Every structure is written in C-alpha cells, then in structure tokens.
Design a binder for this molecule. Structure first.
Ligand code: ADP
Ligand code: A5Z
Ligand code: CL
Ligand code: CL
Ligand code: MG
Ligand code: MG
Length: 265
C-alpha cells in the first residue's frame, strides 16, 4: 500500500536506540502524523526483528484514549517505516526537565491515566515492561498516552534479550532473569510516582552494579516533603514479592489518589 513518496517530511521529533522519529504530512489528505524510521542493518545486527513485529501487532489492535495508535507500516531495502499518531505536546520526560518536580495534583492525575490504560492492557494479558518518562507522550489536551510497545509480551514470561539501557524502572524478578507477569508494570508505576514528586527515581546510582544492588534490596528513602498519603501508596507498590503488590482497582481507589487527581476511572 503506502510508500515513502506519499509523504512530506518535517522536523525531527526524537531519537531512540533504534527509532528516529519525524513529523510528516500525507499528500492527498494533508494528514499530520509521526513516522518512526528504523534501519534494517541495525535491526539485523542486534537481532531485534521480533521486537518490531510485536510492536506493530499489539499497538494496532488496541483502542484506548490513553494509548498511542499505530496506523500502518512499509519498508524499502534500507529501512522499515511505522506510521504513528502525532503527540503535539511532547514527552513527560521533557516536562519533568522543565519543572524539576510535579505537584500532588499533576502527579495523581498522571498516575490515574496510566492505571486506566494498563488496566485495559492487562485485561488482554498484555504486559508493557518498559514504562518510563521517554515513552509517555502528551495529547493536545495534556492527557497522557503510552507508546513504544517494543518490549511488550503475553504473560507469564521469561526474559528474551540483553538489557540495553537503564535498570531504574525494573522490578527485582526481571533484572535477576526470573519469571515475571503483570506485576512488573505495577512496580514501575511506584517507581514513576516517586520520580514525579521528588525529581529523580528511588534507586538511582552511579554505576550499573550498584543500581542493581539497591533495586534487589529495595533501598529507598523519602525526603521530608513527601506527605503520608504519598508514602503509603509508593510503599505498597514497591514490595519485593510481586503477589504482595496491589491490584489496579486498589491504586485507582486509594484515598490519596481520589483526593488529588482531576480525572475519573
Ligand atoms: N508519536 C510521537 N510524537 C512525538 N514524538 C515522538 C513520537 N514517538 C516518539 N517520539 C519521540 O521520539 C522518541 C523515541 O521514540 P520511541 O518509539 O520510544 O523509539 P525507541 O523504541 O527506539 O525508543 C520518544 O522518546 C519521543 O521523544
Ligand atoms: C510487521 C513487520 O514489522 N517489521 C517487519 C520487518 C520487515 Cl517489513 C522487514 C525486515 C524486518 C522486519 Cl521485523 C514486518 C514484516 O514482517
Ligand atoms: Cl486518513
Ligand atoms: Cl485491578
Ligand atoms: Mg522508547
Ligand atoms: Mg523500542
């Protein structure tokens, strides 16, 4: 169907390990979108063809206001192209670098929206496994949206591939290459909530080997300005044994969330 000639390319939107993303308009309809460009030689080299295929399939058959749509794809001897919904207000990552910290109202609202999209996701036994600020995008009304389904699978699961970048958002079971399930996503939720209110993730460290340590021992402390309601939720999500982590109905109805969030479930 589609080909490169059908588009006009505009400004760079972001680089990833593999993805190079651009603003684009389709010629006969003037439709604006995002074009994620991958190099076949980089994909062969690293052996992650299976990740790309899975990203394509999951993200095209899901439909939820808090999850970024995937429309289509095509390739051309050098490259594979994905056609994505455009997110006009950017990443949560950049927003956190702008403000340094989020207030309780902003944080709670963000957590509500993640918990809603993840709930829809888990109801098909799909687990994301890569929830971090670089992969949360912002809609035109400011609403949060989940992207980059490259690492997602069906539960239960064993780990596949080498871990490339940061460990900061991973649960103990996953860094230790043990078996994992839906509860990895909930651990990341607690990691995320803490980073919203403090400005940095709870297990941050100078080296790989020591981040590894702090994560498997669950060594985090709160600074003085973290309120009791916050502390309660974050302590319930960051438990070493997964089955002791709360379900998502419990996150959505926690008193601290219901008091500060500005959207319903
Ligand atoms: N749909 C989009 N709209 C706007 N910016 C995007 C979009 N998709 C990606 N980006 C930017 O490009 C970056 C890389 O995208 P991503 O899909 O996560 O690639 P990779 O899987 O290689 O990390 C994002 O962190 C973001 O900054
Ligand atoms: C759906 C899909 O996603 N990536 C590809 C793909 C293509 Cl076109 C070429 C090389 C490697 C890959 Cl992984 C396909 C098609 O099998
Ligand atoms: Cl269209
Ligand atoms: Cl639930
Ligand atoms: Mg990414
Ligand atoms: Mg990816």
């Amino acid at each position: 169907q589609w080909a490169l000639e059908d588009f006009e390319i505009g400004r760079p939107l972001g680089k990833g390990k593999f993805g190079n993303v651009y603003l684009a308009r389709e010629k006969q309809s003037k439709f604006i979108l995002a074009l994620k460009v991958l190099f076949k030689a980089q994909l062969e080299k690293a052996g992650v063809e299976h990740q790309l295929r899975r990203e394509v399939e999951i993200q095209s058959h899901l439909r939820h206001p808090n999850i970024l749509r995937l429309y289509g794809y095509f390739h051309d001897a050098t490259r594979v192209y994905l056609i994505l919904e455009y997110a006009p207000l950017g990443t949560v990552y950049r927003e956190l670098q702008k403000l340094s910290k989020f207030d309780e109202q902003r944080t709670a609202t963000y957590i509500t929206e993640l918990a809603n999209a993840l709930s829809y996701c888990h109801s098909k036994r799909v687990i994301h496994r890569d929830i971090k600020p670089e992969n949360l995008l912002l809609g035109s009304a400011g609403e949060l949206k989940i992207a980059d389904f490259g690492w997602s699978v069906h539960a239960p699961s064993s780990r596949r591939t080498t871990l490339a970048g940061t460990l900061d958002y991973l649960p103990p079971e996953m860094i230790e290459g043990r078996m994992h399930d839906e509860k990895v996503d909930l651990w990341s939720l607690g990691v995320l909530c803490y980073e919203f209110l403090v400005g940095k993730p709870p297990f941050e460290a100078n080296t790989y080997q020591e981040t590894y340590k702090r994560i498997s021992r669950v060594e985090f402390t709160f600074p003085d300005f973290v309120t009791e309601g916050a502390r309660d939720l974050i302590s319930r999500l960051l438990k070493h044994n997964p089955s002791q982590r709360p379900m998502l109905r419990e996150v959505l109805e926690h008193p601290w969330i219901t008091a500060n969030s500005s959207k319903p479930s």
